[PDB]
Scaffold this active site. Structure first.
Site, short mmCIF file in Angstrom:
data_model
loop_
_atom_site.label_atom_id
_atom_site.label_comp_id
_atom_site.label_asym_id
_atom_site.label_seq_id
_atom_site.Cartn_x
_atom_site.Cartn_y
_atom_site.Cartn_z
N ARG A 35 39.70 18.49 33.04
CA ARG A 35 39.11 18.24 34.37
C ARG A 35 39.68 19.21 35.41
NH1 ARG A 35 40.76 13.95 32.19
NH2 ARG A 35 42.60 13.91 33.55
N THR A 66 44.39 11.11 27.05
CA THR A 66 43.39 10.28 26.35
C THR A 66 43.58 8.80 26.70
OG1 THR A 66 44.70 10.21 24.30
CG2 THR A 66 43.07 12.02 24.53
N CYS A 90 39.23 11.61 15.28
CA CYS A 90 40.54 11.46 15.90
C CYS A 90 41.69 11.08 14.97
CB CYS A 90 40.46 10.45 17.04
SG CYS A 90 41.99 10.23 17.93
N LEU A 91 42.75 11.88 14.98
CA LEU A 91 43.97 11.55 14.25
C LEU A 91 44.89 10.61 15.03
CD1 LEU A 91 44.80 15.03 12.77
CD2 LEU A 91 43.64 13.10 11.66
N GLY A 92 44.74 10.61 16.36
CA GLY A 92 45.54 9.76 17.25
C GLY A 92 45.05 8.33 17.37
C1 HEM Z 1 41.56 6.59 23.72
C2 HEM Z 1 42.28 7.51 23.06
C3 HEM Z 1 41.65 8.70 22.31
C4 HEM Z 1 40.36 9.05 22.23
C5 HEM Z 1 39.12 8.38 22.89
C6 HEM Z 1 40.27 10.25 21.42
C7 HEM Z 1 39.12 10.92 21.09
C8 HEM Z 1 39.03 11.97 20.19
C9 HEM Z 1 37.81 12.63 19.76
C10 HEM Z 1 36.41 12.23 20.26
C11 HEM Z 1 38.12 13.60 18.89
C12 HEM Z 1 37.17 14.58 18.15
C13 HEM Z 1 36.92 15.83 19.03
C14 HEM Z 1 35.96 16.80 18.36
O1 HEM Z 1 35.32 16.45 17.34
O2 HEM Z 1 35.84 17.95 18.85
C15 HEM Z 1 39.57 13.58 18.75
C16 HEM Z 1 40.30 14.42 17.94
C17 HEM Z 1 41.67 14.54 17.92
N1 HEM Z 1 42.59 13.70 18.56
FE1 HEM Z 1 42.05 11.94 19.58
N2 HEM Z 1 41.55 10.57 21.01
C18 HEM Z 1 42.43 9.65 21.54
C19 HEM Z 1 43.80 9.63 21.36
C20 HEM Z 1 44.56 10.61 20.74
C21 HEM Z 1 46.01 10.69 20.75
C22 HEM Z 1 46.93 9.66 21.44
C23 HEM Z 1 46.38 11.79 20.06
C24 HEM Z 1 47.80 12.35 19.73
C25 HEM Z 1 48.97 11.82 20.12
C26 HEM Z 1 45.16 12.42 19.58
C27 HEM Z 1 45.06 13.56 18.81
C28 HEM Z 1 43.90 14.13 18.34
C29 HEM Z 1 43.85 15.32 17.52
C30 HEM Z 1 45.05 16.17 17.04
C31 HEM Z 1 42.39 15.59 17.25
C32 HEM Z 1 41.83 16.76 16.44
C33 HEM Z 1 41.39 16.35 15.04
C34 HEM Z 1 40.69 17.51 14.38
O3 HEM Z 1 40.13 18.39 15.10
O4 HEM Z 1 40.70 17.56 13.13
N3 HEM Z 1 44.07 11.68 20.02
N4 HEM Z 1 40.09 12.57 19.54
C1 LIG Z 2 38.40 16.26 22.72
C2 LIG Z 2 39.86 15.84 22.59
C3 LIG Z 2 40.02 14.40 23.08
C4 LIG Z 2 40.37 16.01 21.16
C5 LIG Z 2 41.87 15.77 21.33
C6 LIG Z 2 42.22 16.28 22.73
C7 LIG Z 2 40.86 16.80 23.22
C8 LIG Z 2 40.74 17.13 24.71
C9 LIG Z 2 40.61 17.98 22.31
O1 LIG Z 2 40.69 19.30 22.70
C10 LIG Z 2 40.24 17.52 20.92
#
Ligand code: HEM
Ligand SMILES: CC1(C)[C@@H]2CC[C@@]1(C)C(=O)C2
Ligand SMILES: [K+]
Length: 405
Positions: free
Chosen positions: A177, A243, A348-350
């Site tokens: 943002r 997030t 999502c891994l998180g």
């Molecule tokens: C409400 C909490 C969260 C939401 C809604 C969310 C949402 C998402 C989404 C939609 C993606 C896929 C993005 C894409 O396909 O381009 C993603 C990927 C990912 N997220 Fe989350 N996320 C959350 C929390 C977290 C947290 C807490 C972490 C780490 C501490 C995290 C780490 C990652 C990573 C490393 C990916 C990349 C996976 C990949 O590209 O293979 N996320 N997340």
């Molecule tokens: C779209 C996301 C939520 C996902 C994890 C962080 C984020 C901003 C990315 O660049 C991949």
């Protein structure tokens, strides 16, 4: 500012949605995006905003496109194009099979087994923050809980100094943002510049913090490179800092405005996990996308090689075709359909850390502060981007209604 309509795009598919400043933002950010699902809007449209790009408005299309990485590449996943082009985070900027070795390494640091081990720590931090707020009868929820709770958990996991939070949080926000004072490239470079010496320090050393584990991981039959480590660690920080931080505020704003939903969880605690899932659907908050690898006809629409397509994860669960009365929060909803954590190989891994943080927050907040409201006459302002958020959330309560545990 509207980019000239490319000659391959039919005029009846034009709908000029601005993902960084959507027209109806004042109604709520989810509401502003849901305008894309009104009866006047086709399911696949072209906006001239933000350089020009496609948008898919329906869960069916969003799921389909996220499964087809051969046509819809994550190499350029952000709009505007200059942001997607600079974007080089791992694993997100890679597709299968290359992406998988890095997902597996990231799972060693944020995967379910890690989260399970963190249970008491997450519990302690929520209880301590909430008990400190409880007798005060007010808070600025964004800065007083939504930020420090998830962010401090992440900084612990990563072994990084809490004093660095204001700087790192500001930088991450410029990638999702932007306020206009930093380019995407500038913000990313600053994050990388912060991580580089830390990674060098932790490489060939036995640390067990998340950065150490990433930096010493083996991928593809060799040590991970310093560059690969930095690109992974930067992404983990963005996930940790922008997030859950935003999601908690959407959820707590809703609870402040809906006493009957608070009453539901106070009096029925085993309903909290289901409630978490329903809130994840209703207050979904992420929207990124993909780039066309080739000319491709998708549902009768001609997409050209290089076109960007926004595939808003936020929209699937808000689609009436996925959930009846989609804007209604129903903790007893029979099938909670959403793509809040994404779909396909980049899912999502998180997500496990996120759910634990949400469930702990709901239980430990409502146990101590069952009754609260938005500060009288406050107008809550949302902000839209790759991840959407809440600008401020002033809450008030009578401390006599609270409970010290
Ligand atoms: C409400 C909490 C969260 C939401 C809604 C969310 C949402 C998402 C989404 C939609 C993606 C896929 C993005 C894409 O396909 O381009 C993603 C990927 C990912 N997220 Fe989350 N996320 C959350 C929390 C977290 C947290 C807490 C972490 C780490 C501490 C995290 C780490 C990652 C990573 C490393 C990916 C990349 C996976 C990949 O590209 O293979 N996320 N997340
Ligand atoms: C779209 C996301 C939520 C996902 C994890 C962080 C984020 C901003 C990315 O660049 C991949
Ligand atoms: K890129």
């Amino acid at each position: 500012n509207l980019a000239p309509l490319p000659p391959h795009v039919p005029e009846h598919l034009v709908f000029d949605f601005d993902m960084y400043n959507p027209s109806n933002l004042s109604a709520g950010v989810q509401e502003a995006w849901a305008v894309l699902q009104e009866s006047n809007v086709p399911d696949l449209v072209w906006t001239r905003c933000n350089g020009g790009h496609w948008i898919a408005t329906r869960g069916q299309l969003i799921r389909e496109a996220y499964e087809d990485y051969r046509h819809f590449s994550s190499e350029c996943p952000f709009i505007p194009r200059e942001a997607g082009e600079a974007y080089d985070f791992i694993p997100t900027s890679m597709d299968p099979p290359e992406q998988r070795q890095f997902r597996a390494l990231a799972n060693q640091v944020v995967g379910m087994p890690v989260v399970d081990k963190l249970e008491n720590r997450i519990q302690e931090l929520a209880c301590s923050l909430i008990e400190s707020l409880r007798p005060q009868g007010q808070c600025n929820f964004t800065e007083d809980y939504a930020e420090p709770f998830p962010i401090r958990i992440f900084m612990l996991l990563a072994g990084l100094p809490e004093e660095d939070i204001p700087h790192l949080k500001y930088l991450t926000d410029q990638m999702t943002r932007p306020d206009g004072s930093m380019t995407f490239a500038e913000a990313k470079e600053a994050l990388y510049d912060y991580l580089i010496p830390i990674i060098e320090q932790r490489r060939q050393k036995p640390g067990t913090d998340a950065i150490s584990i990433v930096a010493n991981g083996q991928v593809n039959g060799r040590p991970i490179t310093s560059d690969e480590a930095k690109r992974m660690c930067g992404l983990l920080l963005v996930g940790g800092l922008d997030t859950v931080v935003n999601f908690l505020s959407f959820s707590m704003e809703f609870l402040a405005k809906s006493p009957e939903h608070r009453q539901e969880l106070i009096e029925r605690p085993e309903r909290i996990p289901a409630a978490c899932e329903e809130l994840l659907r209703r207050f979904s908050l992420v929207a990124d996308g993909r780039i066309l690898t080739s000319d491709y006809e998708f549902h009768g629409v001609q997409l050209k090689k290089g076109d960007q397509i926004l595939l808003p994860q936020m929209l699937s669960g808000l689609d009436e075709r996925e959930n009846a009365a989609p804007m209604h929060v129903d903790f007893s909803r029979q099938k909670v359909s959403h793509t809040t954590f994404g779909h396909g190989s980049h899912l999502c891994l998180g997500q496990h850390l996120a759910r634990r943080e949400i469930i702990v927050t709901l239980k430990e907040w409502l146990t101590r502060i069952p009754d609260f409201s938005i500060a009288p006459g406050a107008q809550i302002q949302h902000k839209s981007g790759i991840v959407s958020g809440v600008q401020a959330l002033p809450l008030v309560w009578d401390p006599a209604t609270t409970k010290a545990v």
